[PDB]
Amino acid sequence: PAPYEICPEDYLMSMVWKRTPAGDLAFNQCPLNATGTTSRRCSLSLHGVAFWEQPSFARCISNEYRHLQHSIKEHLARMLAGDGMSQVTKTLLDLTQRKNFYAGDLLMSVEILRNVTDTFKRASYIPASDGVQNFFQIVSNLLDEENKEKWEDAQQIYPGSIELMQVIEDFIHIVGMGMMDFQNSYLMTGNVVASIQKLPAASVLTDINFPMKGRKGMVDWARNSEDRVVIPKSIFTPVSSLDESSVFVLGAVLYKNLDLILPTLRNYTVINSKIIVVTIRPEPKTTDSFLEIELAHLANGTLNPYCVLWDDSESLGTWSTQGCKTVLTDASHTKCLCDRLSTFAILAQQP
């Protein structure tokens, strides 16, 4: 039983936003050369006064991205399908290189990479080495620091960056399947370093360290990093619950700035480290085999850092401290001891 506050008619971004009650959305179309819609929320301030939030472009798609996604079906309608996907990948890379995404283009880009990854899988087609590099460069471009606000916009409607991590893991597994036994490839870009290894069960005799630190062939930012994971050898033992014919694909990923966009799903909580991933297929027994993850802090003045892993069991899942012990090495570094495979990070309260 109170006054009903209304956001005034407004013209931000050359569109008419009609008078709209607090709590409600206004809708509009997208700029020229895009399709979809825009929306804008009217909200109530701490002091009970209506104000407009920023317009969302989460559902605007640039024409070139839409045309790209539609051309994918044309290539499907095995070799044709796979060569097709390689062309789509090349075209996506060129696009992401022009930047000037809409938020909706970030989402569309993930959807394209997802459809490309699923197509490779269904067609039993392994992309060539330059296609692998192109895929990673695309991801690195999507994760440009500049896109941070657009990702936040996109993520009002869909967990695009989580979906992107999943697409990255699936792609890694497709590539690993086509590798030789014992083969190890590093993918390096400005924002992402990935390691992919094919490892026969029982053949791993020492713990595996990622990323390798001793080489100047390694991109600067990662070589510099004090982030790393030690993967225990025992997890590569065959279990009757796997045998001498079993082969694991091990992927490990270090992200330079994925921390800027992954959701924390908690109030006054921030991601306070880079993001590190360890993925193994088929799944081994991991119980009582602890990965040791070392993560430098991003910022000082945080309350109580703690190790989490991504739990896939909506929002495509959540962060959990279940299965991780947090070791507070010093004010600037934390060591996580986790007996589950996943995406790892340090959260902390900012208050």
Ligand SMILES: *[C@@H]1O[C@H](CO)[C@@H](O[C@@H]2O[C@H](CO)[C@@H](O)[C@H](O)[C@H]2NC(C)=O)[C@H](O[C@H]2O[C@@H](C)[C@@H](O)[C@@H](O)[C@@H]2O)[C@H]1NC(C)=O
């Ligand atoms: C919207 O997209 C269209 C293409 O569908 C753009 O038209 C391009 O205009 C340039 C002008 O040099 C022309 O060389 C290109 O051939 C043409 N693109 C295509 C694919 O044919 C259009 O760009 C427009 O930008 C405005 C600011 C102005 O320079 C105008 O001349 C130009 O057409 C895009 N429109 C907007 C608003 O960016």
Ligand SMILES: *[C@@H]1O[C@H](CO)[C@@H](O[C@@H]2O[C@H](CO)[C@@H](O)[C@H](O)[C@H]2NC(C)=O)[C@H](O)[C@H]1NC(C)=O
């Ligand atoms: C492209 O990816 C999307 C989502 O991963 C696939 O789904 C399309 O969109 C909705 C949402 O899932 C589905 O209900 C539709 O059936 C899909 N549309 C089409 C064109 O079938 C979509 O299947 C993928 N497309 C390709 C070429 O693999």
